[PDB]
Structure 1
Amino acid sequence: AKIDNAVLPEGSLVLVTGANGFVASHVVEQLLEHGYKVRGTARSASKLANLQKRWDAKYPGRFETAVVEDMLKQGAYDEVIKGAAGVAHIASVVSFSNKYDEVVTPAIGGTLNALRAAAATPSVKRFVLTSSTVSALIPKPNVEGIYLDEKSWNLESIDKAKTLPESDPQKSLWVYAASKTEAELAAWKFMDENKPHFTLNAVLPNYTIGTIFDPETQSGSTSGWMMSLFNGEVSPALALMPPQYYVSAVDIGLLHLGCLVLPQIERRRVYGTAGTFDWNTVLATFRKLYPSKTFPADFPDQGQDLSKFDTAPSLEILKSLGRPGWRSIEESIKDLVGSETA
């Protein structure tokens, strides 16, 4: 069909863990759009009601809500993974509670739990793990000589996370970074040690910008934070986020799709890094999209991201799916906040 030589047959069922999440909902949307059936998990059926409603109207009988309230529980995926040909693990831990052992352990645990379920389920042929650019690094404004490729690991986050004082403005970020880094490493180690019968790929998005399908419960996401600024809310938590790379929610969905069905994509770490930005380029875009609206004035210069990412597999995927190149930051932000029109 739309995708020639897709490793997963048309109409195949794909299990998407944590389908009510912001990023996950776009992965789900792209899969459904491409004719694949999806069974999305959430800690409760109610957390997926609004999205279920949306998908029932748009893709009649293609999406199914599945409940998994304890992603760490042994055998938690025994029933939901049944009949799945593909798996996109996007479910995340439940906290910003600093204790390294309390944040990192569950992260690794949830990842391996889903990986073992897939290894035990013969129907599963492809597995895509939603990681993050923090598994490679924490952004470093104005620093030259940074090039991230598939062999780049945020090794410094491990120590930084367990040594930095709680007074450090970024300790919370470092703990999160360590959790993502350790989890992805554990995922690749499991592939290397158990040699399961499925292909693994990982998508590493940076700052995802796009339409918030369900604002009711998705306002804490990256786009949720951006929408907050659009509404005039300025907070230290926001300014604490440095200049880095954005990526369209649409492209992130496409990248996951590619990792799930493209034959030429195997054992890759796919960077979701379209271009750089800072809060001032974001405000500039807001002003252009809504010329009559009042917005906060520019933030003090926060520097710029001078790093570069090896997006080879990413671009390969986008081209193969017929959506070459990254969607621009202006169109991405327009997806999120719309524009002054009538």
Structure 2
Amino acid sequence: AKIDNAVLPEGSLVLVTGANGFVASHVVEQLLEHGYKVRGTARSASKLANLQKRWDAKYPGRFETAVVEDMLKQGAYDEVIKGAAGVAHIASVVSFSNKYDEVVTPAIGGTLNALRAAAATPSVKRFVLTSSTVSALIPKPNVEGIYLDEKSWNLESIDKAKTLPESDPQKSLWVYAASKTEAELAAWKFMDENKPHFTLNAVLPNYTIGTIFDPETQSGSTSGWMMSLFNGEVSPALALMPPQYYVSAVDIGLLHLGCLVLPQIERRRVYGTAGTFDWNTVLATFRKLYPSKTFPADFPDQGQDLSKFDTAPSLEILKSLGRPGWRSIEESIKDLVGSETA
């Protein structure tokens, strides 16, 4: 169809774990938009109710809600994975407690549980793991000489996550980074050791900006935090996030799609890093979109992100899907907050 030489046949079924998540929901949307059928999991059917309603209207009978209360439970995917040709593991365990083993173990556990299910299911030919740029690094403002490629790993997060005192403002951020790093490392290790009959690719988004399909339940996401600033809320947790790269939710969805169906994309770590930003460039965009609205004044200078990412596979995917280039930050933020128009 739209995609020539697609590895997964038209209308193929794709299992998307944690489909009620912000990023996940865009992955689902892009799949449905491209004619693929989707079975999305959530810890409860109710958690997917609003989105199910949305997708039933836009793509009648293309999305199916599947319940998986414990993504760590042995045999958790035995039923929902049946007949799936592709799998997008986007589900993540809910735990923000600074206990290392308590956070890292489940992260690795959930990832391997999904991979083992896929390995045990012959119909699965493609698997895309939703990782994060934190598996490569935690942003370092004004620091020169940082180039991240597919061989870049956040090895420092492992030590820091367990040595830094609880008083370090970024403690929880390092634990999270360690969890994503170890989890992705475990995924590639599984592929090398077991050599399953499917191809693995990982998408590493930085700060995803886009339309929040279900504000009621997706406001804790990156875009949710940005929306809070739009609404005038300034929180310390916000001033914790340093300058880094944004990526359109639309593009992240396209990146996952590419990893699932493009033949020339195999064993890649696809960076979702469109361009740099800081809270002031965000506020500037808000003011431009809504000139009549009152917004918080600029934050103190937070420096800027001088790091660079090897986005080759990312650009390759976007072009192959007929949507070359990264959607701009203005258009991405417009997707999130809209604009003063009528």
User: Shorter-normalised TM-score: what interval?
Assistant: over 0.9
The alignment partner of 1:236 has SS state of coil
What is the CA distance between 1:94 and its match in structure 2? 0.8
The residue that corresponds to 1:195 in the other structure is: 195
The residue that corresponds to 1:12 in the other structure is: 12
The CA deviation string for residues 88-147 of structure 1, in whole angstroms up to 9 with x for no partner, is 000011111110000000000000000000000000000000000000000000000000
The alignment partner of 2:83 has SS state of coil
The residue that corresponds to 1:117 in the other structure is: 117
The residue that corresponds to 2:220 in the other structure is: 220
What is the CA distance between 1:12 and its match in structure 2? 0.0
The CA deviation string for residues 18-68 of structure 1, in whole angstroms up to 9 with x for no partner, is 000000000000000000000000000000000000000000000000000
Q: Which runs of 5+ in 1 are unaligned?
A: none
What is the CA distance between 1:307 and its match in structure 2? 0.0
What is the CA distance between 1:16 and its match in structure 2? 0.0
CA distance in 2, matches of 1:93, 1:327: 30
The CA deviation string for residues 183-234 of structure 1, in whole angstroms up to 9 with x for no partner, is 0000000000000000000000000000000000000000000000000000
CA distance in 1, matches of 2:16, 2:98: 27
CA distance in 2, matches of 1:281, 1:180: 28
The residue that corresponds to 2:71 in the other structure is: 71
CA distance in 2, matches of 1:257, 1:102: 32
TM-score by length of structure 1 reads 1.00
What is the CA distance between 1:165 and its match in structure 2? 0.1
The residue that corresponds to 1:154 in the other structure is: 154
CA distance in 2, matches of 1:261, 1:172: 35
TM-score by length of structure 2 reads 1.00
What is the CA distance between 1:170 and its match in structure 2? 0.1
CA distance in 1, matches of 2:97, 2:17: 22
The alignment partner of 1:237 has SS state of coil
The residue that corresponds to 1:263 in the other structure is: 263
CA distance in 1, matches of 2:43, 2:203: 23
CA distance in 2, matches of 1:294, 1:240: 23
Matches within 5 A, 1:1-342: 1-342=1-342
CA distance in 1, matches of 2:59, 2:102: 39
CA distance in 2, matches of 1:149, 1:93: 27
CA distance in 2, matches of 1:223, 1:100: 27
CA distance in 2, matches of 1:138, 1:175: 11
The alignment partner of 2:237 has SS state of helix
The CA deviation string for residues 277-306 of structure 1, in whole angstroms up to 9 with x for no partner, is 000000000000000000000000000000
The alignment partner of 1:82 has SS state of coil
The alignment partner of 1:16 has SS state of strand
CA distance in 1, matches of 2:241, 2:220: 14
CA distance in 1, matches of 2:104, 2:119: 23
What is the CA distance between 1:243 and its match in structure 2? 0.1
CA distance in 1, matches of 2:209, 2:196: 34
CA distance in 1, matches of 2:44, 2:115: 22
Runs of 4+ in 1 over 3 A off after TM superposition: none
Over aligned residues, Cα RMSD in angstroms? Answer: 0.2
For these two proteins, the number of residue pairs brought into alignment is 342
The alignment partner of 2:127 has SS state of strand
CA distance in 1, matches of 2:129, 2:77: 16
The CA deviation string for residues 230-253 of structure 1, in whole angstroms up to 9 with x for no partner, is 000001000000000000000000
The alignment partner of 1:65 has SS state of strand
The alignment partner of 2:325 has SS state of coil
CA distance in 2, matches of 1:315, 1:192: 26
The alignment partner of 1:270 has SS state of strand
The CA deviation string for residues 161-191 of structure 1, in whole angstroms up to 9 with x for no partner, is 0000000000000000000000000000000
CA distance in 1, matches of 2:237, 2:313: 33
CA distance in 2, matches of 1:318, 1:194: 31
CA distance in 1, matches of 2:197, 2:98: 36
The alignment partner of 2:56 has SS state of helix
